[PDB]
């Protein structure tokens, strides 16, 4: 008797039992080595689909540019980037008279948003390419480096506060002849070693000053740093993604807020909604298209997907979209929106780290950088790498970068690209023929609903749609997509069967340990179970199991097994003594080797609150000690929100709410100088918070200096503390004298002027 798992689908339908098809217990593929090979591949692929158009040289950057827009219409089913401006404009003109007043209103609100939006809004964008150091930094850093850097060139923009004058300086910084900036350089210092050679390169970095020419800076500003995508699911081969510079971000958010303010008032958009709000708004829209099915006629759905979506689009199309969308708005805002496409139109692509060569005989390896990539005979590369480097030649630049006019680099204008895909759906009908189409669009993934008298005519409607998409620079996937009569389909990896079915395996990775800290991960793990009970169709028995499977792994992750068990370990030895000392054992936390009180009924409540009354008075005083040493300085974002792929959880400020070392770093890089840089800002902020108690909660506003304020505040504190009777005349005149100095210190220009 032989077993077969696919035979399950005879008794059960596939959509209701789709959870089994996703192997999300298993290991996803990670990035081995460099991503230069894939980066070059995409650089070619992008130019391959646009090579028929006009080639020309940029007089500013001095690079190889390609322009397929208003190019020759293709005569083949291979991918095309050869869009037609005329068509895109008509599609928008069709869309405007369908939703009259939308285009100008979205431009109004996005503008009246911009007028208030401050520089610090840029801080929340995770990864960012820091031009000053040619490395990926975290947003707020790349911002602050650029702010300080700009001040050297006499570009005091961020001081005013608003994003407008900061972005004014960004486009003014491209006019500068010589760009001075703060930068990091390593120092190759030697040390003794007992390893083969007898020495060791301990790389120490420090803060220095570097200069750059106008042209070199523009190239760095227009750059995008590439890498390989880790843990990409549902795909065999690895693909390379990119990251954006800090300059362009300011202009992007304005256009994405505009394209958002369009997509909000569109029924066919699957954006910007998320969670159940999506599931709801979709099921609504599915009905809105089903209803268009005429009398005595068939309704069909195409399971849509686009290949080479980010590669076949073009900034020049998006540039027209803004100039169309903004029609009625004033000039400065129209100029503002036009920038974000332009900087992608003239963008430059970094080529990662580079390839590596070896010799099996002598057992030696060596890294080959991007600048010195061609300084070598081409025969010495392998067969597939040779062909890549051959086609890279003309687009390649001599300082280790590739020019790249077409393409949008693996996602960035996600909203406005949906608007373009929606504008394709906004046509509906061609030639007054016997069909109608509409659909759902969400970035590259779409879903077309075609209605007609019979299904033979539906295919001619699909054929026309496929052909209309080619005119807008959109490539429907013949290889992957398919179609059928209405009933079931796929869309954003959410399946349909007389309603959107629940799918559990998708969310399976989140059930495990989060990786923040003991106290938090606990409440997170249960909140995941709570959400998945409601949203993703998990029953009580599976939920109760999921409780056990979390606590089980939780104990092995954090090494906090039951107090009445003999699992020998370092922490576990102390747990056993705590188990014996305490009388109220049922009140202990799991992190302190306690029992798991959690069950379906009490998931929403936090662990510490459930057990508080059952604790001992001496145990809770330590567990919940106010000035305990493991927390540190708190922020409102740290307690509330957490990272999953963001969401917000609920927990108490316990001793188990602790933080990590500052993730190691790569190599014996002794980052002493740079750690002082971090503390220097911290201490200032920590002193700032003491002067201004709010700070953490209420983001304070002021164009004046931090010191200048702290002086004026600490003055008045003493003024009040003398009158109310907290400080004496001696302590008051102390302060007024001490502060007096601080004033003279804070209005100098160089030394601290010590005295004898």
């Amino acid at each position: 008797m032989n077993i077969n798992p696919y035979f399950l689908f005879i008794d059960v339908p596939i959509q209701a039992a789709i959870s089994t098809t996703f192997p999300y217990t298993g290991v996803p593929p990670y990035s081995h080595g460099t991503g230069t090979g894939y980066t070059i591949d995409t650089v070619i692929r992008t130019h391959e689909y646009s090579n028929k158009g006009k080639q020309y040289i940029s007089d500013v950057t001095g690079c190889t540019m390609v322009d397929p827009t208003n190019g020759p219409l293709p005569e083949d089913n291979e991918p095309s980037a050869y869009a037609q401006l005329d068509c895109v404009l008509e599609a928008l003109d069709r869309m405007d008279e369908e939703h009259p007043g939308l285009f100008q209103a979205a431009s109004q609100n996005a503008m009246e948003t911009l007028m208030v939006t401050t520089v610090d809004k840029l801080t929340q964008g995770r990864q960012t390419f820091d031009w000053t150091v040619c490395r990926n930094q975290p947003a707020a850093t790349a911002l602050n480096t650029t702010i300080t850097s700009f001040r050297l060139n006499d570009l005091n923009g961020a001081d005013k506060g608003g994003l407008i004058p900061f972005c004014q300086d960004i486009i003014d910084s491209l006019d500068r002849p010589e760009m001075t900036f703060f930068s990091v350089k390593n120092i190759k210092k030697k040390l003794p070693a007992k390893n083969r050679k007898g020495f060791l390169i301990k790389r120490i970095p420090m803060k220095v000053k570097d200069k750059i020419t106008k042209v070199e800076y523009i190239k760095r500003a227009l750059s995008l740093n590439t890498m390989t995508k880790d843990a990409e699911r549902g795909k065999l081969k690895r693909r390379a993604i990119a990251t954006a510079g800090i300059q362009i971000r300011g202009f992007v958010l304005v256009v994405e807020n505009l394209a958002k303010n369009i997509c909000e008032n569109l029924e066919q958009s699957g954006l910007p909604v998320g969670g159940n709000e999506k599931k709801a708004k979709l099921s609504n829209a599915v009905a809105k298209m089903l209803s268009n099915c005429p009398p005595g006629g068939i309704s069909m759905t195409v399971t849509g997907d686009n290949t080479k979506w980010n590669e076949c689009l073009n900034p020049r199309i998006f540039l027209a979209m803004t100039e169309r969308i903004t029609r009625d708005s004033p000039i400065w805002f129209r100029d503002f929106c036009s920038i974000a496409p332009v900087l992608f139109s003239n963008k430059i692509a970094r080529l990662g780290k580079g390839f590596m060569i070896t010799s099996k005989t002598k057992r030696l390896k060596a890294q080959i950088p991007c600048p010195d990539l061609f300084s070598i005979p081409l025969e010495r590369y392998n067969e597939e790498t040779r062909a890549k480097l051959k086609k890279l030649k003309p687009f390649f630049n001599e300082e280790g970068t590739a020019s790249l006019s077409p393409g949008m680099m693996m996602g960035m204008f996600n909203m406005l690209s949906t608007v373009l895909g929606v504008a394709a759906l906004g046509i509906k009908n061609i030639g007054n023929k016997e069909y109608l189409w509409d659909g759902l669009q969400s970035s590259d993934d779409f879903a077309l609903f075609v209605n007609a008298k019979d299904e033979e005519t539906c295919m001619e409607g699909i054929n026309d749609f496929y052909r209309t998409c080619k005119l807008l620079g959109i490539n429907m996937s013949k290889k992957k997509s398919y179609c059928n009569e209405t009933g079931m389909f796929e869309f954003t990896s959410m399946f349909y069967r007389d309603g959107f079915v629940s799918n559990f395996a998708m969310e399976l990775p989140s059930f495990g340990v989060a990786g923040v800290n003991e106290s938090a991960d606990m409440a997170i793990g249960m909140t995941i179970i709570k959400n998945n009970m409601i949203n993703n169709g998990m029953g009580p028995a599976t939920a109760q199991t999921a409780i056990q499977l979390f606590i089980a792994d939780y104990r092995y992750t954090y090494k906090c097994h039951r107090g009445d068990s003999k699992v020998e370990g370092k922490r576990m030895k102390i747990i056993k003594e705590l188990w014996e000392n305490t009388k109220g054992r049922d009140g202990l936390l799991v992190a302190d080797g306690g029992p798991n009180i959690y069950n379906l009924r009490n998931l929403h409540i936090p662990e510490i609150v459930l057990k508080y009354n059952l604790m001992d008075p001496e145990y809770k005083g330590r567990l919940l000690h106010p000035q305990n040493p493991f927390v540190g300085h708190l922020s409102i974002e740290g307690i509330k929100e957490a990272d999953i792929t963001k969401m917000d959880y609920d927990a108490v400020s316990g001793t188990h709410s602790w933080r990590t070392k500052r993730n190691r770093s790569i190599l014996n890089t002794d980052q002493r100088n740079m750690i002082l840089e971090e503390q220097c800002y911290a201490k200032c902020c920590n002193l700032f918070e003491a002067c201004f108690n709010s700070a953490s909660y209420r983001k304070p506003v002021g164009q004046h200096s931090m010191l200048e304020a702290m002086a004026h505040r600490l003055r008045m504190d003493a003024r009040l503390d003398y009158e109310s009777g907290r400080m004496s005349k001696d302590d008051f005149e102390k302060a007024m004298a001490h502060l007096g100095e601080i004033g003279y210190i804070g209005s100098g220009s160089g030394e601290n002027l010590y005295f004898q």
């Binding site: 610090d120 409601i534 005083g621 933080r659 200032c684």
Partner: protein, 524 residues
């Protein structure tokens, strides 16, 4: 007093020339940037990193202080913390055991007031303990994907208002502006003040825990039956796709409390104000000096984003947003496409009388709701081109079809009028043409369906047609369709400012009206 100690530390920072130029150059604005500044790399896969580091020797980082030094170096052959001082902080690190030791052998802390600080969480446990659990019932439940409040509040407010409350509680000097509709929670402020006094827990936490019990957490969920927070919190246990569960909570009555009263209060202000002349001027002078419990009605209508119709009418009269939606008696409509010109014309109707009606011209589409049934409308100039609905209550499925046929202004509707239609309201005033036609066709439904006619049903898997009796059929009414698929809730997130007429009708900025006085519910 701390005051002086700050100044000394500031002077000691101005000795270091790097920190001097930070405080000199960096702005109060930029504070929010430099606080997030770090070196490091944000490492992918933190769950992988946690399991790895937890197995290592000293993964934790420790804050320096007098309390840090009370942790010893070793304990029975176990390394708790490490000496190796980093040159920057002169600081330290520690291991997983260091925390466990602290909870075992560490010092006692003043945990007084802890219950009152995290009160919002403790009220959840109060609800679970005292709650009695009813019977379980296995049966298929149709779950409406509604917008709902996730967590119950002490007092609902918007973020803008609640912040200035939180400020006057914890940071009374820095609060600044004395706002109008903010302080009047002086009962709540003075109450929170005295409760959160003796505790010495970090302010940033107190503020967050106030915000959790003063700010609305409203998300979309699959819901059926009760729509109250103290239920919703337990929703995971109360119901699933294919089962149900009864539940009765701690039972102190919240959320619904104000929502229910605010409805009635507004409705009753209307009924009195309609009669006498200049209803607006009375509706204002009344609602100004009305009260719910302690709050004036202004702050309740503004803070709570619920209401029915009367709420939004009273809102508009006083002067706040209401919601971008359109109502016609019992019918609700949200514009999804198109725009029309209400244009005056002389109209003959079926019975043989000339009524002066305004005619909606142009192609349009609408997301529409009535009671338990929801659907989608498409109309044009005096023509209902298409209508869709979902399987629900037959009383409301009928009303929806009727009310759509009314506002569609279909010629087949106008021709189906028989007899006189002189209807009046409560005050004894003539209803305007279309509000008249509404009540006629709701009453005499059968006269319309015969005049309408029938056509073929659309042959799409999950659709079927209907007839006069509201039953399944291969024939269908010209335009109307029914679907098996379940539809989204009402859904009206965005908000808009509105003006008001003498007769308590609400005018959108364009020129049309959305919420009429006549559209309220009589149910008391």
């Amino acid at each position: 007093a701390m005051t002086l100690a700050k100044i000394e530390l500031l002077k000691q920072l101005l000795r270091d020339n790097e920190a001097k130029t930070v405080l000199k150059q960096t702005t109060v604005d930029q504070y929010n940037i430099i606080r997030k500044f770090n070196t490091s790399r944000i490492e992918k896969n933190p769950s992988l990193r946690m399991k790895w580091a937890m197995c290592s020797n000293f993964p934790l980082a420790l804050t320096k202080g007098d309390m840090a030094n009370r942790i010893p170096l070793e304990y029975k052959g176990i390394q708790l913390k490490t000496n190796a001082e980093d040159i920057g902080t002169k600081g330290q690190m520690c291991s997983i055991a260091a925390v466990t030791w602290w909870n075992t052998y560490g010092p006692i802390g003043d945990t007084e007031g802890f219950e009152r600080v995290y009160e919002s969480f403790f009220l959840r446990k109060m609800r679970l303990d005292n709650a009695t659990w009813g019977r379980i019932t296995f049966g298929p439940v149709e779950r409406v994907r509604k917008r709902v409040l996730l967590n119950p509040l002490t007092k609902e407010m918007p973020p803008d208002e609640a912040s200035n409350v939180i400020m006057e509680i914890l940071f009374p000097k820095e609060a600044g502006i004395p706002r109008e509709s903010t302080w009047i929670h002086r009962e709540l402020i003075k109450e929170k003040r005295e409760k959160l006094k003796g505790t010495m827990i970090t302010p940033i936490v107190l503020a967050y825990m106030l915000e959790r019990e003063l700010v609305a957490r409203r998300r979309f969920l699959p819901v059926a039956g009760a729509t109250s927070a103290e239920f919703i919190e337990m929703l995971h246990c109360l119901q699933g796709e294919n089962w149900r569960q009864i539940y009765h909570p701690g039972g102190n009555k919240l959320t619904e409390s104000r929502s229910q009263s605010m409805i009635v209060a507004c409705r009753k202000i209307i009924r009195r104000s309609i009669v006498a002349s200049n209803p607006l001027e009375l509706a204002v002078e009344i609602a100004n000096k009305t009260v719910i419990d302690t709050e004036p009605l202004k702050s309740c209508l503004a803070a709570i984003d619920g209401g029915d119709v009367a709420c939004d009418i009273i809102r508009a009269a006083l002067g706040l947003k209401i919601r971008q939606r359109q109502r016609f008696g019992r019918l609700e409509l949200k514009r999804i496409s198109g725009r029309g010109f209400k244009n005056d014309e002389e109209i003959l109707i079926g019975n043989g009388t000339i009524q002066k009606i305004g005619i909606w011209d142009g192609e349009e589409e609408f997301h529409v709701r009535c009671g338990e049934c929801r659907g989608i409308l498409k109309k044009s100039k005096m023509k209902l081109e298409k209508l869709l609905i979902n399987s629900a209550k037959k009383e409301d499925m009928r009303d929806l079809i009727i009310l759509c046929m009314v506002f569609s202004q279909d010629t087949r509707m106008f021709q189906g009028v028989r007899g006189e239609i002189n209807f009046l309201n409560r005050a004894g005033q003539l209803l305007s043409p279309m509000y008249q036609l509404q009540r006629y066709f709701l009453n005499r439904s059968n006269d319309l369906f015969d005049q309408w006619g029938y056509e073929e049903s659309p042959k799409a898997s999950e659709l079927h047609g209907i007839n006069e009796s509201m039953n399944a059929s291969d024939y269908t009414l010209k335009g109307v369709v029914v679907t098996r698929n379940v539809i989204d809730d009402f859904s009206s997130t965005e908000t808009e400012k509105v003006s008001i007429t003498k007769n308590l009708s609400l005018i959108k900025r364009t020129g049309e009206v959305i919420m009429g006085a006549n559209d309220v519910s009589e149910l008391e």
